[PDB]
Symmetry: C2
Subunit: 411 residues, 2 copies
């Protein structure tokens, strides 16, 4: 019927309006009829000065405590006249004034966002509480300047607006494990009121980096007489990831052809012998060590073992042709034809054989490791009844191995 | 002079005719006491000088006399005594397929994550074969499957190894693990087989966001519920397992106004954090979010409607009052009063009563505004005074009452 508007939190005793003038009767009538104003329920904000016919405040009106969310804030008062009994209805509209700053319930919010999160994905954040409404309510959301994210204020929901976080640039834990941002709520009033809170984003480690080997190739040499438990070479790999995505499993791939006496440890990556070696049998070993991640990522390296020849085999002497007894007057007579063989390699397999120089016999080097023992020129029967001959062959290895065979020739 | 014979040929078999090839008669060989000599190890060959023939003495094993090195050639020197003469002859052993492809491990374990991209290659152990060339491993086949296929790489100095290739993406949610049969095919005729079991274990990754059982929750709670009261329990399920399957629950209240609601991360139980009041807040709307330990999230809406309990009794206020009433006054007004009830529904609807026998009656002027008045002129002599008691009561359950007593003295003008 009759509505007057006044701002919120107006000081007590302030004049609201002229009731007598607007309603259409003299002050004398109000004084005579003992006019009194009554709010129907709670405490009365208004007083009616009947001496002047004016309507003024008694108490400071708080919008957020008398209306709250409901808008517009209108209070209903009934002014009464005694004789005759008469009622007039008057309404008081409280204008909202920005007397509350946006504030966040929690000082800091923790977020866990996995490394493998795709861009344009949206996250929901807690909102700043504001008692005020309309233009005096929360109107904007701004985040501290950063490369990865940006903040968008969504005006959804029945009332007010909430903050949403949007990702534009893909995340990587290897560069930044965690990020820290400053979230600020800006009021719509003039001047705006601030409200800050800390946003803590924790990047979750995922398996996106394959284990890589420190060294691409390993070349190590091992003697053929090494014990069964001997450390050949230890290979290692590093993973950029952490946790179960950072643990590395080592397994070996031997060559397609021929079994190998090598075994590797899953954890340490130590390559040890699983059997005995032999340079004469296998001169070289080539294999590939693979490091598989606990997720599935793998990195491969090549390992080449060159065995070292040890002079473990002594010269072998074999008799091809021999003459049990020798003539007396035979010139350039051939006693025996023998050969030497050495399975070892290098100068360990090169042989030299010797005989007593005092003896009339001499061996002539015929072919490759092929010699013939013979007597040069005629011999005497009376002078020598018999000959015990022992030829001793030795290699040029380290150490030197010797072999001797005894033969007795009767002239 | 080189002669060729297959590996593992039975002892005593004739290798070749030396006399013919070298170019002299058998008699010369017999006369000179011709003897054949292997330079080093045991001798496979024997030279029968009675026929001038060359024959085996022992069964030749390629893999034990040559091994990897090819061609397998043995060097012999044949000797003639008088005069002393040397002729060099060589024996080439042809490899025969007498070894079946075999795998070192009976079964191989692979771990391939669910998020594995197609065309990615994995390395598998190779089947060991003693033979070489065409008699070695020549082909690799895998048991027919939807996801993978096998490719044989001819890398390494010798022979070829098996590689596994992925063509169709993997999902742990459909199939947790796969089992395949790897077979190594020899090149010889007929080919020899060699099988092994391949077990692929798919590793769980975070690719499924937690989803809520019900999109919306409607629950009602009285305004006088204790601080520790179970309002509603919300739950969500995650397809993933392990840490990718664990769910964290947190609530989002409205932008405006604080709420007395608190949520548990684990149980998803929404409980009161304070007291309620229907007169203050009639409705609550919030959003429950389920965040994964990886970062994936699922959202639902929860709306709680509080129920008004008739906890407030009617309030009676006197606006205007007259202590005493004239004698011959017609329709005289004793008082003007009002009633107020903060409750809602029939809990806030009020009815007020007075003794009907009394001449006075209350007239309903406005909404919960009444005026007490006397019906007709009154007489002084009959009644010196009146005890009046107005009783106002709401229509709620239970009914709350409030009463005010006023005593009016009817006085004549004189
Ligand atoms: C290694 O072995 C695999 C499979 O081995 C087979 O299975 C084992 C158990 C043995 O039985 C082997 O004998 C088998 O070969 C080979 O891969 C595939 O082999 C299959 C054989 O069935 C091929 O499928 C066939 O494709 C035919 C179509 O061929 C058309 O094109 C050719 C081109 O030359 C032409 O000649 C022909 O006339 C057709 O026009 C089809 O008709 C037939 O029914 C059958 O389905 C398949 O194509 C082979 N795939 C590949 C990728 O090779 C490998 O070839 C083998 N590798 C070697 C020997 O090196
Ligand atoms: C003015 O009149 C009122 C109303 O009394 C009625 O009207 C008068 C004209 C007569 O006709 C009375 O007979 C009528 O009852 C008087 O109020 C009454 O007071 C008496 C004395 O205390 C009450 O009687 C007692 O009440 C005790 C308490 O009752 C309470 O509980 C009931 C519900 O169970 C509740 O309604 C009431 O308001 C009390 O809260 C009780 O323990 C005791 O046994 C006895 O019954 C009588 O109940 C009152 N009336 C009513 C309607 O309750 C005023 O006293 C009187 N004025 C003066 C100055 O005396
Ligand atoms: C929130 O406040 C900012 C002021 O910091 C408004 O300005 C935006 O950002 C910069 C200011 O540094 C301007 O250069 C841009 O042009 C503004 N962006 C847009 C989209 O206009 C920003 O507009 C405010 N947000 C809202 C929703 O009003
Ligand atoms: C709110 O207040 C802060 C200071 O507390 C300002 O930095 C901001 O711009 C806004 O005015
Ligand atoms: C918001 O940010 C300010 C600094 O800009 C702090 O002082 C305040 O406590 C809140 O964290
Ligand atoms: C060896 O033998 C298997 C059966 O045992 C065959 O499937 C294979 O193709 C090869 O002939
Ligand atoms: Ca205020
Ligand atoms: Ca305000
Ligand atoms: Ca504000
Ligand atoms: Ca990365
Ligand atoms: Ca990794
Ligand atoms: Ca990572
Ligand atoms: Ca050796
Ligand atoms: Ca050696
Ligand atoms: Ca030697
Ligand atoms: Ca063999
Ligand atoms: Ca063979
Ligand atoms: Ca074979
Ligand atoms: Ca999946
Ligand atoms: Ca999940
Ligand atoms: Ca999964
Ligand atoms: Ca209440
Ligand atoms: Ca209530
Ligand atoms: Ca009530």
């Amino acid at each position: 019927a009759i509505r007057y508007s006044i701002p919120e939190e107006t000081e007590s005793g302030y004049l609201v309006a002229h009731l007598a003038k607007d309603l259409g009767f003299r002050v004398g009538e109000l004084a005579t009829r003992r006019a009194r104003i009554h709010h129907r329920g709670n405490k009365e904000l208004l007083q009616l000065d009947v001496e002047t016919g004016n309507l003024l405040l008694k108490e400071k009106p708080d919008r957020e405590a008398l209306c709250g969310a409901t808008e517009p804030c209108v209070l209903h008062f009934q002014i009464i006249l005694e004789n005759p009994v008469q009622f007039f209805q008057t309404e008081l509209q409280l204008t909202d004034i920005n007397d509350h700053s946006p504030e966040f319930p929690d000082t800091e919010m923790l977020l866990k966002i996995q490394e493998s999160t795709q861009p344009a994905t949206v996250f929901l954040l807690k909102a700043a509480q504001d008692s005020d409404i309309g233009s005096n309510a929360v109107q904007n959301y701004t985040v501290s300047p950063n490369l990865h994210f940006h903040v968008v204020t969504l005006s959804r929901s029945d009332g007010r607006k909430y903050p949403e976080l949007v990702l534009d640039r893909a995340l990587d834990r290897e560069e930044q494990p965690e990020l820290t941002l400053i979230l600020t709520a800006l009021d719509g009033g003039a001047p705006p009121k601030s409200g800050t809170t800390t946003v803590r984003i924790e990047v979750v480690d995922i398996n996106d980096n394959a284990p890589e080997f420190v060294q691409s190739l390993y070349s190590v040499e091992v003697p053929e007489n090494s014990p069964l438990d001997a450390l050949v070479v230890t290979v290692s790999a590093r993973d950029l990831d952490a946790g179960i995505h950072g643990n590395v499993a080592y397994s070996l791939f031997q060559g397609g052809g021929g079994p190998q006496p090598f075994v590797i440890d899953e954890i340490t990556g130590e390559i040890r012998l699983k059997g005995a070696l032999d340079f004469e049998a296998t001169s070289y070993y080539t294999m590939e060590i693979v490091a598989t991640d606990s997720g599935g990522l793998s990195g491969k390296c090549t390992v080449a073992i060159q065995v070292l020849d040890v002079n473990d085999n002594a010269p072998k002497l074999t008799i091809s042709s021999l003459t049990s007894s020798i003539p007396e007057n035979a010139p350039e007579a051939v006693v025996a034809v023998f050969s030497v063989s050495d399975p070892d390699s290098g100068d360990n397999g090169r042989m030299v054989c010797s005989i007593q120089n005092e003896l009339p016999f001499l061996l002539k080097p015929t072919f490759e490791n092929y010699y013939t023992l013979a007597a040069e020129g005629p011999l005497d029967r009376e002078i020598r009844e018999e000959y015990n001959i022992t030829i001793i062959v030795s290699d040029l290895g380290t150490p030197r191995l010797t072999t001797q065979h005894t033969i007795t020739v009767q002239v």
